[PDB]
Design a protein around this ligand. Structure first.
Ligand SMILES: *[C@@H]1O[C@H](CO)[C@@H](O)[C@H](O)[C@H]1NC(C)=O
Ligand SMILES: [Cu+2]
Length: 213
């Protein structure tokens, strides 16, 4: 139970939900539980637009992060996605095959079982690929909590969508492109997984491969 309320730029948080789409029930720190739901895109009611969210100017190559409200208190992978808006980020619903992955981490095998780079984290950061073209993007941050993921319907998704306007961009062609919902299936080997009883040797975060450019 955590949220990603604000973007981090130049080693300072911006305002809670200023450059990030606030979502229905964000107060309760509730997980998305259905990867077929519109919720999996930007969380509940957040996709339809950002008519009251701002867009942060950023550079291709810049490290943009998110604050974490309390901390990442569940085990699992961190993932980030972006999507080019056809105009202003605040008018973009993020529909269609427009999402590409820019980041994902995976676990370490210990004596005690899997540890994760996200465990206890109070902030998270990513790097806008240096070749990403000029444009308005959604920046979708996701932690997939896997502590109850042994049964179908048991993986938890903790998400937010930030709005950024990218300059200093190159001639990258982000791909492959996927949809939320649609990228994830509840039987996916990174979503339906017993992280404990046989200790995973080769855990595979779901969705498409990372676009590096
Ligand atoms: C996140 O921040 C750490 C600490 O400065 C850094 O080592 C790492 O390269 C950064 N990761 C990304 C994805 O920008
Ligand atoms: Cu929780």
């Amino acid at each position: 139970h955590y949220v990603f309320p604000a973007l981090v730029q130049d080693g300072a948080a911006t305002g809670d939900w200023k450059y990030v789409r606030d979502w229905t029930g964000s107060y309760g720190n509730g997980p998305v539980e259905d990867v077929t739901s519109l919720d999996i895109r930007c969380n509940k009611d957040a996709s339809t637009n950002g008519n009251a969210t701002e867009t942060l100017p950023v550079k291709a190559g810049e490290e943009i992060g998110f604050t974490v409200r309390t901390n990442i208190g569940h085990p699992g992978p961190l993932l980030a996605y972006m999507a080019k808006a056809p105009g202003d980020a605040s008018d973009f619903d993020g529909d269609g095959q427009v999402w590409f992955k820019i980041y994902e981490d995976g676990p370490t095998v210990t004596d005690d079982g899997l540890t994760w780079p996200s465990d206890g984290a109070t902030n998270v950061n990513f790097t806008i690929p240096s070749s990403l073209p000029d444009g308005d993007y959604l920046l979708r941050v996701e932690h997939i909590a896997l502590h109850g993921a042994g049964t179908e319907g048991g993986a938890q998704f903790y998400l937010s969508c930030g709005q950024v306007s990218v300059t200093g961009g190159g001639n990258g062609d982000p791909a492959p492109l996927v949809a939320f919902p649609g990228a994830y299936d509840p039987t996916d080997p990174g979503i339906l997984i017993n992280i404990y009883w046989p200790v995973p040797t080769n855990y595979t975060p779901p969705g498409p491969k990372v676009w590096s450019g």
